[PDB]
Ligand binder design. Sequence first.
Ligand code: HEM
Ligand code: HEM
Ligand SMILES: C[C@H](O)[C@H](O)[C@H]1CNc2nc(N)[nH]c(=O)c2N1
Ligand SMILES: C[C@H](O)[C@H](O)[C@H]1CNc2nc(N)[nH]c(=O)c2N1
Ligand SMILES: CNCC#Cc1cc(C)cc(N)n1
Ligand SMILES: CNCC#Cc1cc(C)cc(N)n1
Ligand SMILES: [Cl-]
Ligand SMILES: [Cl-]
Ligand SMILES: [Gd]
Ligand SMILES: [Gd]
Ligand SMILES: [Zn+2]
Lengths: 400, 402
Amino acid sequence: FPRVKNWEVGSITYDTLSAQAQQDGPCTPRRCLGSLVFPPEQLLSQARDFINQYYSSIKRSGSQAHEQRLQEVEAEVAATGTYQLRESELVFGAKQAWRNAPRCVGRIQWGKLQVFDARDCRSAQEMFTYICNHIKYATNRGNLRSAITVFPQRCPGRGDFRIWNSQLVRYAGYRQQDGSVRGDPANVEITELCIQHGWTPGNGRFDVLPLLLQAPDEPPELFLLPPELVLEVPLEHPTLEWFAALGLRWYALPAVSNMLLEIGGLEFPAAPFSGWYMSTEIGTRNLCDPHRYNILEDVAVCMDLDTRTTSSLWKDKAAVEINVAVLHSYQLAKVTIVDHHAATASFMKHLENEQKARGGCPADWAWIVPPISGSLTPVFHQEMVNYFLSPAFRYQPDPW
Amino acid sequence: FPRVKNWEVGSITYDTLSAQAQQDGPCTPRRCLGSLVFPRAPEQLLSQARDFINQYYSSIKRSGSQAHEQRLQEVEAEVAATGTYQLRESELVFGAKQAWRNAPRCVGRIQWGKLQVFDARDCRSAQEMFTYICNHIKYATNRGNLRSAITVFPQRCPGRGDFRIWNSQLVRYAGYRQQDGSVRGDPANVEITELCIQHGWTPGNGRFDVLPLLLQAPDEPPELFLLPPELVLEVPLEHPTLEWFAALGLRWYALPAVSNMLLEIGGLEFPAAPFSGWYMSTEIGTRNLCDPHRYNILEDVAVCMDLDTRTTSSLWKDKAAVEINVAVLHSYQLAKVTIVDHHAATASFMKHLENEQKARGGCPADWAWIVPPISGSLTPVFHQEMVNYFLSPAFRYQPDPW
Ligand code: HEM
Ligand code: HEM
Ligand SMILES: C[C@H](O)[C@H](O)[C@H]1CNc2nc(N)[nH]c(=O)c2N1
Ligand SMILES: C[C@H](O)[C@H](O)[C@H]1CNc2nc(N)[nH]c(=O)c2N1
Ligand SMILES: CNCC#Cc1cc(C)cc(N)n1
Ligand SMILES: CNCC#Cc1cc(C)cc(N)n1
Ligand SMILES: [Cl-]
Ligand SMILES: [Cl-]
Ligand SMILES: [Gd]
Ligand SMILES: [Gd]
Ligand SMILES: [Zn+2]
């Protein structure tokens, strides 16, 4: 069992939970690949295993309904080639997928998740109304609440439910008279899929893209989001009066709409989940990545920093203030947000809870460590073990 | 072969060099352990030696020549007769350079060709060992214009014990346990400090007392050796605009010289081969001064900066650490002591990966060690996927000799 040390304190644990791993990862004894981003009847074995998880979690191994529920899935597959999850199981499976996500630093919250069941969804027009319920529920006038909406489980020989945008809220990416991009360059492609399918393109750096929702074996359909429902936060700095004039904004709800939820062998290619932001996601990655909004130099000129030499650490000063402006703005607007120090400190608490309950925790070091001030947070000093448990959120190819 | 993406540009390469990794690391297909600090007969000596010699004769563009099979047969016959063999001097120099080249946790490998190799394999005692080490420090420091060097002491051989430098670096500050429970000085060095005192060193009681060296000759107890103060170049720390910063009384030394690692070349083992370069400012500013278990000055600096420390979202920790780094850089520049900031170092590491892709089809790299401990995604290495693996020649960790 892997020895795991915390170098701040000196304490040692052993990950016994690693023993239960399922889908082999990308690493071999020859070379480590942990820094890479995107590295019939067998349906029964994963179903048995998930049901066993459910019942031991509610202290129900060696019991009647446990014995009993094993047969129904047995019978359901035999008769139909698949099965339906009991509503409580879909609830328990969604939380466990969240809990097992190695790249999520906010899993201290995993037990509080609202599960919208859209398994009887029927059309793209129906998807949109579920999506719109979710958003308004999750947003909650800025007091954000974790939530996932679960669309029907994919079935053999018949189409898929899929959301085409990577998130429920994404800003446009327009290409210009010189090839380059006005707006968010992360979404250049889906902006061009949208302009294609009827959308009248704007000219702004912060235009909420229209959704593309896909009924099975039908082409995607454009849906505009009602602007009253897309809560957004204008960015301003508590003491840098000019920062507001840069016209920067970000949206309130982080809602990932391109990952595939897998519970007990069943695959849900449409299952958007949402929480609230950690401030470095907006202030550091989305605003300061060279291939995202790349605002770093503009803020530095405004601060009258010396940008002629790297050793003035003007990049570091400008980045810290951009993060300050994000935190201050969301707090002033009363939108739930958490800083990287509070977030990582809560995750160290999660790791400890998980050690007592399950004997370990799959964590991906490069993703848990924040992208500014790494070693100032306690996770930097924490050794971690990465591996795959089910149920899980998985990546999936693009439906085109 | 593993596909490697740069997420800032879109570039894509394939690490073919990884195929040739002829030792195992800690990960399996079940689980990745890449974030752990310390994961870990003539036939095998021969095949390591054979492979290194092939490397050497490739580097001199004489692969498959008279000299080449000459040396191979020669090395086997020397193993057959003696159970080991000796490196020629130019083989030693190529072997130390490749070891630096192959080191996955080193961000400064752009410089890997520029290395001064001191051959101390004739060294015969701890006293001579000390004289060689003083000469290393003198040459490498070069009055502040630092030069990369390594001194190689006699290899491990059967029948005799190893030379060892008990100290983890040639320059280290003492760490004394206080009246209460606190450490005065550097808490990373409580153990080596206790060993020196137990071996008769007379301790000080400052926060920056340079430690003596504990030098072990084969089959010999370690011997204490004081470093002449004018040999250890130090830098008082001041901040260019925060004039109260100088009153903290903080110092760091110029020369980073790791002295406890094992150099392995062609199957042969050199347990004493100290190497030195020059510092990247985050090692001092962020890690050494701001780690909670090191000097731990962050809160004190932030209170002095009049930052609001009662709440994390004011980002006082981040603000105060950026200024401690500014101070480190400005102080070394003022003092005319070589130093590189994490923006310049990561930028030149990106050229190294480029040069190495062309030369060898890859480059072993430990992402979590290459990405600096502040401003990670502000540097380009954050956005570069990397493949960690073990190539020989190599610097390797070894157990403490006590
Ligand atoms: C409630 C507050 C939450 C916070 C502060 C949080 C924080 C984060 C952060 C910072 C990331 C890194 C994403 C990136 O860098 O692109 C992440 C990833 C992730 N989160 Fe969370 N999260 C929260 C809730 C949730 C919920 C409710 C779910 C699912 C039900 C979830 C599932 C995931 C998954 C699957 C990833 C991996 C994303 C990927 O691989 O691209 N998180 N989280
Ligand atoms: C000349 C400028 C150099 C720079 C800027 C540099 C930079 C660095 C840095 C920042 C680290 C991480 C240290 C830590 O976090 O503890 C490192 C590690 C390392 N470097 Fe370099 N280095 C230089 C020269 C050298 C030389 C001359 C050698 C050997 C010939 C070398 C071999 C290594 C090794 C073996 C490690 C890993 C040590 C460990 O894992 O504890 N470096 N380097
Ligand atoms: C190449 C590297 O693995 C990649 O840029 C990763 C590093 N760590 C990350 N961590 C998080 N949370 N999100 C990311 O997008 C990344 N990017
Ligand atoms: C646990 C974790 O791996 C550990 O704190 C590592 C992280 N990355 C590092 N990177 C460097 N360069 N130096 C270090 O000491 C560490 N420490
Ligand atoms: C490309 N990753 C975007 C993202 C994200 C994300 C998702 C959730 C649920 C919370 C959070 N804080 N962030
Ligand atoms: C715990 N490793 C300490 C270290 C180090 C180091 C070593 C060298 C040669 C250069 C450098 N810049 N840093
Ligand atoms: Cl985002
Ligand atoms: Cl150091
Ligand atoms: Gd001005
Ligand atoms: Gd001043
Ligand atoms: Zn790995």
